[PDB]
Amino acid sequence: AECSVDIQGNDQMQFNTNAITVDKSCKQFTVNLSHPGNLPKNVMGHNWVLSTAADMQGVVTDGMASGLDKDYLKPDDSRVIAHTKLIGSGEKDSVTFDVSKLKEGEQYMFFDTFPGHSALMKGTLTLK
């Protein structure tokens, strides 16, 4: 099975997809994030952040409260399973994580924690 996915976030506060599936037989999984557009990070920064569905609200609320110099994530937030950096237009960042962190029967969400973006920039992550 493939073990990576390419995700884009644009100047329109959109991701290219709202559903990612991770095949069990992957030991690691990589998300490659890019930002088409022209807007810089402080105004249209995007990141890809993974937690359980239950934790998504907290991560987003705490991240937004943390500010740009924290890339909009609360320091030491243990609800965050994996994430990319916050990137502005033209930049790119990849994260690779251990698939063993993810458990059967759990609901996962990926999302962006830049202020307001999770309204649109979120999706499900499913183990298969």
Query: What is the contact surface with Cu ion in residues (CB under 5 A)?
Result: 1, 46, 112, 114, 117
Hey, what are 92's tokens?
Answer: 């790119």
CB of 79 to Cu ion, least distance (A): 19
Question: What one-character-per-residue DSSP string does 30-58 give?
Answer: EEEEE--SS--HHHH-B--EEEEHHHHHH
CB of 14 to Cu ion, least distance (A): 9
CB of 57 to Cu ion, least distance (A): 17
> For Cu ion, which is the closer residue by CB, 29 or 108?
29
Rounded to 5 degrees, what are φ and ψ at 23? -75, 135
> For Cu ion, which is the closer residue by CB, 83 or 117?
117
Amino acid at 28: Q
